[PDB]
Scaffold this active site. Structure first.
Site, short mmCIF file in Angstrom:
data_model
loop_
_atom_site.label_atom_id
_atom_site.label_comp_id
_atom_site.label_asym_id
_atom_site.label_seq_id
_atom_site.Cartn_x
_atom_site.Cartn_y
_atom_site.Cartn_z
N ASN A 100 2.39 13.40 5.77
CA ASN A 100 2.95 12.36 4.86
C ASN A 100 3.27 13.00 3.51
O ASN A 100 2.52 13.85 3.03
CB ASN A 100 1.96 11.22 4.66
CG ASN A 100 1.94 10.23 5.81
OD1 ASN A 100 2.96 9.60 6.11
ND2 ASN A 100 0.80 10.10 6.45
N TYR A 149 0.87 -1.20 0.00
CA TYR A 149 0.00 0.00 0.00
C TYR A 149 0.90 1.24 0.00
O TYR A 149 1.97 1.21 -0.65
CB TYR A 149 -1.03 -0.10 1.13
CG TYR A 149 -2.30 0.65 0.85
CD1 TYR A 149 -3.04 0.34 -0.26
CD2 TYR A 149 -2.72 1.72 1.64
CE1 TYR A 149 -4.18 1.04 -0.57
CE2 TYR A 149 -3.86 2.44 1.34
CZ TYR A 149 -4.59 2.11 0.21
OH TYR A 149 -5.74 2.74 -0.15
N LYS A 192 -6.19 -1.74 -0.96
CA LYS A 192 -6.94 -1.53 0.31
C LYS A 192 -7.72 -2.80 0.66
O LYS A 192 -7.77 -3.18 1.90
CB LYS A 192 -7.87 -0.32 0.23
CG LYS A 192 -8.44 0.14 1.56
CD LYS A 192 -7.38 0.80 2.42
CE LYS A 192 -8.00 1.65 3.51
NZ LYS A 192 -7.08 2.71 3.98
N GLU A 228 -12.40 5.41 -0.46
CA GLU A 228 -10.93 5.51 -0.35
C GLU A 228 -10.46 6.56 -1.35
O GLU A 228 -10.81 6.45 -2.56
CB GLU A 228 -10.26 4.15 -0.57
CG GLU A 228 -8.76 4.19 -0.29
CD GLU A 228 -8.34 4.17 1.18
OE1 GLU A 228 -9.22 4.17 2.05
OE2 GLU A 228 -7.10 4.09 1.44
N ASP A 229 -9.66 7.51 -0.88
CA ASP A 229 -8.76 8.32 -1.75
C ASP A 229 -9.63 9.20 -2.66
O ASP A 229 -9.29 9.43 -3.84
CB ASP A 229 -7.80 7.40 -2.52
CG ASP A 229 -6.42 7.97 -2.81
OD1 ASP A 229 -6.09 9.00 -2.25
OD2 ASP A 229 -5.68 7.35 -3.59
N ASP A 237 -12.22 5.90 5.27
CA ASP A 237 -11.09 5.57 6.14
C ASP A 237 -10.14 6.77 6.32
O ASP A 237 -9.64 6.93 7.44
CB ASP A 237 -10.28 4.37 5.65
CG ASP A 237 -9.21 4.08 6.67
OD1 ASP A 237 -9.59 3.91 7.84
OD2 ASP A 237 -8.02 4.10 6.31
N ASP A 238 -9.86 7.53 5.26
CA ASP A 238 -8.99 8.72 5.29
C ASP A 238 -9.50 9.73 6.34
O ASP A 238 -8.71 10.25 7.09
CB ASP A 238 -8.98 9.41 3.92
CG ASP A 238 -8.45 8.60 2.76
OD1 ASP A 238 -7.45 7.91 2.93
OD2 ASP A 238 -9.03 8.73 1.66
N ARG A 242 -7.59 11.31 -5.46
CA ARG A 242 -6.52 11.38 -4.42
C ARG A 242 -6.97 12.30 -3.28
O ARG A 242 -7.26 13.49 -3.55
CB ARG A 242 -5.17 11.83 -4.97
CG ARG A 242 -4.73 11.14 -6.26
CD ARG A 242 -4.81 9.62 -6.16
NE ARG A 242 -3.91 8.99 -5.20
CZ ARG A 242 -2.61 8.81 -5.38
NH1 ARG A 242 -1.97 9.30 -6.43
NH2 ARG A 242 -1.92 8.14 -4.49
#
Ligand code: SZD
Ligand code: SZD
Lengths: 544, 544
Positions: A399, A86, A157, A228-229, A251-252, A139
């Protein structure tokens, strides 16, 4: 035939007697290995490759040939494999090596298939699907629009649900909703296989995502839908649109805040400086950063029953203008108003613009790095926090490693070992005067798999914030007196099956309490439920 | 299901209408490509990788997912792919990346399965197998014993029959006869999966290979058995033991000599210096080198009906002692006696030890490099051959490029463009005074696939030397007046299907003439046979 089916293939782990009985003698080299031996061998094949991308490529081939051996190797080397399977290797694989995902099970939606989403789902012929990961390749961090190649993110994921919480690999579905791409290279690339057009406007975006959500609830009614993303223009609005009507989470947003809150509360315990005595600089003021601060407050309120208003007043929010205050004279974004100081004068607000001067004035005991602007937690700033507490809590969470507010090494060095550090990335240990320090990594893997497994068993009508808060508290409580004595803020990553089993048990019990659970077969007491959840988890071992 | 079967999977070449009918809409990204477009895309994915081994790895994944697209890409880029999918990349893949062959169809024999060879073959459940490539991983050149990992060589050679002669990929079988390994690294390697013992002695070697040959003739009676990459202690003796009783050949021995003879005779035609006027230095005197010289003589005798004795007297054999003569005073190995000068005195033999002095004395018109001792064809030696002919024939055939007797560039440079060059490796063109020169590569691919396809159709009781000689002459004759006018010694490599069809037709007609052909369905006149052979070839195109 047995060999060509990745779910039952055991390769060299087939005994000589099995090879005769199954008529595959002479289809394998003659050595017979145990799964453990196969894992050590695959681990050597991986480390033979130098670059993360070539390691991922080898692992994709293992997953294609022997699925049990793939998951067994990930579980045995989890901390080391995580950055290969990942973030950040998977994104590079999507961007420049998207062929690595061609052979994977996956479902592609676009406007050309408008009205056929339910037929496409039916046609995939899945059984009782438990988890669906969906992205549009936009993203979360807004870097490298992947468009269609976003399918690689959903695929990676989905593999983390299987490894982390023993979601059966046949019961998970990766999805790309291709609504176009603003990636200029891709729009001109003759080998781009996705929709070759700029991203659709909101009205058409929501028409297709609505159809997706309705199709999935009819054809895959047992599934948790995880977003996700998705980019910031949509991800928050998606949760607002769907959180009550469908079994879904992001989740983010929700995962990240559950994990950071659990770790931060354990940092508070080690600090001696109790939650109402903490003065916390929140460096960064996006919706996400504010979400994490609110998740810390909600968790401390649940665990300790302090008034949430008193917890909110421990936070000093810093945006690009400076300290967020009511006397600053600007019009605050809605999300910044909650954490705005009411106790700082216009005149003081004018002199509270640089992080250095804000730290000098606020005298914080904690620095939370959610800023995404490189290393703002300078030696001078860390020395000032040492004036305010014997155990500075320093969380450089931005990050990747280059955008981080400070290296754990510098944090430990500058505090002579006193710093309590959590990181958004793995870092090696630092030794100071013979004493060893290692940051606790707040990996998202601690929470999403257990939420997925809990929502798969309990079959809740929806995933209200109560279930994420329960998962956050569950994680916090799994950090043992011993872990805490060694300075760890989280249970060990390699114990992920146990962590997921516990998180899932606690999520189910919360769903039962709220009466939103649709599965009446489950135990309703924690001991018996935990035993039941552990038995339900798919294990990467040769079964038959 | 369609998608997971590499023989019928078309990926993105499935039209939108096909995707709805087959219920796979949404299992692929939405772009629809033709095979040609898929090939250009795969070709770009290959060139994205830098090292031959990483290119091979990508191609292995294509072969696993879409077999039609794999073979279509090889055929479209054959000269460039050849060094990646066989020598020398395939040997490096066997030696250090043997996991690249795990997923391939393949049959493993060893002493543990003594008496069960026929059961193991039956159990593989192949239909009318046409070609079986077998190795023991010992290596023809005796470098890098691969043991069990030799299966990679059989797998790569089998793919060249499919690409070169349209052997149907379902009708070809790669085989490793694991009789141990003398590879010391492998014997101590915990990840070696083969027989962990030193190579068996001859008596046990022949017990297992006899059982292999008898099992294959009963269970796979239509097959050609091709021996690949056997060491010199066994390869010659194997052909002696089996050539009459079974349908078998050795490509390293018999293929190499057929290809070099065909090219050498076309070099003679371009030289003007006719075969009885050639004075040929054979630099190197192993069994293989002598075999090639004898194949040149046998071909010139067939094509031109010169007495073979007169052709043999055009050859000057050089071994490590010097010119092979009857007056030298040493006891000659049997294989050297045939080509030994009878016309050179003891006193002259004593002064004929270095290649330089041998060339000065013999005044050759040709240098054949079969020496395997680096670059012995010096500028001084090439200048001397220029004294003896206007068109020096220079064949640096020793592999790899470092062991070569001379670079084509130097040959062309030193002769100012007069040199007629064939190479054992591909080399880029050399330009001299605006005029371009390129060596003709004698690749083994010109002959073995056509022999395999001819023996597959004709079903001969055996493969006598007549059939290899026919294949050599066939190849020679396919070099057109135009090819010859441009200095080419062979038909173009990229025309391999046509070359194989012709070679195969000529082999069948020879088998029919000798009455060893078992298939009475075939036309017996060349025009009608050629048309029939071309129709029988498997083509890498989407069929249904
Ligand atoms: O499973 C097969 N072979 C096998 C041969 C050695 C070892 C093994 S193993 O399962 O014991 N180990 C293993 C596996 C695949 C991996 O990944 C990679 F290298 F292939 F990419 C790595 C290790 C497996 C097999 C599968 C088929 F579909 C067809 C066939 F003919 C053979
Ligand atoms: O075939 C499938 N997908 C596909 C998606 C894009 C393109 C293509 S393609 O066949 O048009 N091109 C292609 C292929 C494989 C290659 O090799 C590599 F990259 F996968 F290693 C390279 C190119 C094929 C497929 C196969 C399955 F078994 C299951 C499944 F869900 C999908």
């Amino acid at each position: 035939a047995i060999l060509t089916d990745r779910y039952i293939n055991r390769g060299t782990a087939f005994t000589m007697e099995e090879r005769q009985k199954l008529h595959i003698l002479g289809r394998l080299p003659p050595v017979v290995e145990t799964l453990e031996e196969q894992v050590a061998r695959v681990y050597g094949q991986v480390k033979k490759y130098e670059k993360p991308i070539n390691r991922y490529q080898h692992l994709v081939s293992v997953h294609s040939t022997n699925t049990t051996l793939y998951y067994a190797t990930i579980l045995a080397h989890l901390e080391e494999m995580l950055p290969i399977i990942y973030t950040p290797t998977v994104g590079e694989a999507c961007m420049e090596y998207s062929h690595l995902f061609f052979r994977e099970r996956g479902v592609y939606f676009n406007r050309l298939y408008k009205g056929q989403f339910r037929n496409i789902m039916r046609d995939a012929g899945y059984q009782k699907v438990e988890v669906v990961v969906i992205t549009d390749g936009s993203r979360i961090l807004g870097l490298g629009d992947l468009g269609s190649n976003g399918i690689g993110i959903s695929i990676g994921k989905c593999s983390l649900y299987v490894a982390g919480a023993g979601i059966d690999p046949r019961l998970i579905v990766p999805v790309i909703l291709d609504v176009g791409t603003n990636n200029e290279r891709y729009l001109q690339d003759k080998d781009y296989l996705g929709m070759r057009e700029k991203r659709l406007g909101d009205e058409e975006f929501y028409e297709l995502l609505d159809e997706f959500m309705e199709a999935a609830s009819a054809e895959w009614p047992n599934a948790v839908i995880q977003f996700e993303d998705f980019s910031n223009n949509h991800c928050f609005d998606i949760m607002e649109r769907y959180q009550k009507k469908y079994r879904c989470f992001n989740d983010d947003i929700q995962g990240t805040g559950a994990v950071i809150a659990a770790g931060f509360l354990n940092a508070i315990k080690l600090s001696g400086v109790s939650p109402l005595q903490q003065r916390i600089v929140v460096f960064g003021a996006g919706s996400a950063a504010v979400g994490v601060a609110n998740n810390i407050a909600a968790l401390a309120a649940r665990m300790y029953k302090f008034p949430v208003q008193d917890l909110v007043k421990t936070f000093y929010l810093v945006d690009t203008k400076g300290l967020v205050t009511t006397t600053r004279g600007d019009q605050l974004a809605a999300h910044k108003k909650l954490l705005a100081r009411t106790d700082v004068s216009a005149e003081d607000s004018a002199k509270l613009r640089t992080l250095e001067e804000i730290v000098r004035f606020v005298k914080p005991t904690t620095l939370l790095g959610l800023g995404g602007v490189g290393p703002a937690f300078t030696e001078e700033i860390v020395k000032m926090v040492m004036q305010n507490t014997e155990r500075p809590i320093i969380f450089p969470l931005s990050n990747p490693t280059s955008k981080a507010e400070v290296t754990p090494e510098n944090a430990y060095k500058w505090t002579n070992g006193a710093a309590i550090v959590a990181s958004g990335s793995p870092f090696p240990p630092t030794t100071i005067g013979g004493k060893t320090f290692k940051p606790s990594q707040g990996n998202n893997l601690y929470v999403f798999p257990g939420v997925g497994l809990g929502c798969a068993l309990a079959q809740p009508t929806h995933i209200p914030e109560e279930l994420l808060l329960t998962a956050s508290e569950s994680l916090n409580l799994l950090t043992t007196e011993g872990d805490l004595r060694e300075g760890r803020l989280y249970p060990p990553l390699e114990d992920i099956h146990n962590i997921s089993a516990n998180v899932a048990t606690d999520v189910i019990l919360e769903a039962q309490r709220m009466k939103i659970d649709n599965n009446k077969k489950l135990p309703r007491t924690r001991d018996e439920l935990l035993a039941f959840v552990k038995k339900a988890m798919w294990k990467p071992v040769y079964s038959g």
